[PDB]
Amino acid sequence: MEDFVRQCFNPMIVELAEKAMKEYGEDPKIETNKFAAICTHLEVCFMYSDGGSKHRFEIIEGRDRIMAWTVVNSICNTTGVEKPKFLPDLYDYKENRFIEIGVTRREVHIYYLEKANKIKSEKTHIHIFSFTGEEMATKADYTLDEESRARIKTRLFTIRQEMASRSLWDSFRQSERA
Ligand SMILES: O=C(NCCc1ccccc1)c1nc([C@@H]2CCCN2C(=O)c2c(F)cccc2F)[nH]c(=O)c1O
Ligand SMILES: [Mg+2]
Ligand SMILES: [Mn+2]
């Protein structure tokens, strides 16, 4: 799985994921399913931000904490939207709302509820993807067009099929905890 991750994800993504794990005392060479999941969520966030017009989204995920909050507080001051309690993943300039992106090995409805319970921001939009083509978003408002979402869902399916061909999928799919 460590070899899978290093060959299927961009080195910038891999470096950010290693750093995120090491900041919590986790070793990417040992907790390899977590390593893979962090990389996958990063790639989905970056794909999502590419899915609209140029300048539609600001990326918050993948930044160090100081810069991430600088972006969030700057947007709140400039647009007046409510400041979130936790860092979200994107800001949507067209809809004027923060977005929390989730990628789940379980089922999108469970994960959506967990994310809504945790962030409890009311104003933050939640958009969930699975590895088997399901998605679930706040108010069935999926933000992007069907073509962009299909490209994300196809990428996740491709990751799943690649892990399975290496007998990695069974362990990864059962590694997500509530
Ligand atoms: O922004 C996020 N975490 C930053 C703040 C953060 C850091 C640590 C714990 C909670 C929040 C974020 N985290 C997740 C999942 C679930 C929560 C942890 N986690 C990680 O990936 C992760 C990680 F962050 C650090 C170390 C190891 C990890 F496994 N899922 C998202 O969808 C998402 O946006
Ligand atoms: Mg995040
Ligand atoms: Mn997220």
Which of 38, 98, 125 has most ligand 1 atoms within 8 Å of CB, for mutation?
38
Distance from residue 89's CA to the centre of ligand 3 (Å): 6
97 Cα–ligand 1 center, Å: 20
Q: Ligand 1, residue 38: give the atom nearest the CA.
A: 21
Distance CA 8, CA 29 (A): 16
Going from the C-alpha of 68 to that of each of 24, 43, 63, 72, the distances in angstroms are 18, 17, 5, 6
CA distance 173 to 159: 12
Give how far the C-alpha of residue 6 lies from the chain's centroid of Cα atoms, to the nearest Å: 18
42 lines ligand 1 (CB under 6 A): no
If one residue of 30, 41, 106, 112 were mutated to test the ligand 1 pocket, choosing by the most ligand atoms within 8 A of its CB, it would be: 41
Answer whether 17's CB lies under 8 Å from 42's CB: yes
- For residue 18, say whether it is annotated as part of any ligand binding site: no
Beta carbons of 54 and 93 less than 8 angstroms apart: no
From CA 177, how far away is CA 154, in angstroms rounded?
Answer: 24
Partnered with residue 169 across adjacent β-strands are none
> Closest Cα to atom 21, ligand 1: which residue?
38
122 lines ligand 1 (CB under 6 A): no
| Sequence-ordered list of residues with C-beta below 8 angstroms from that of 69, at least 6 positions apart, any chain | 87
Closest of 124, 116, 78 to residue 97, by C-alpha: 124
Assign residue 34 the CATH number of its domain: 3.40.91.90
Q: Token pair of 102, please? A: 């989730």
Burial class (CB in 10 A: 0-12, 13-18, 19+), 76: middle
SS3 166: coil
Contact 143, 137 (CB under 8 A): yes
Q: How far is the CA of 44 from the centre of ligand 2 (A)?
A: 11
Structural domain count, the chain: 1
Cβ(101)–Cβ(89) below 8 Å:
yes
CA contacts within 13 A on the Cβ side of 112: 16
Q: Which domain holds residue 50?
A: 1-178
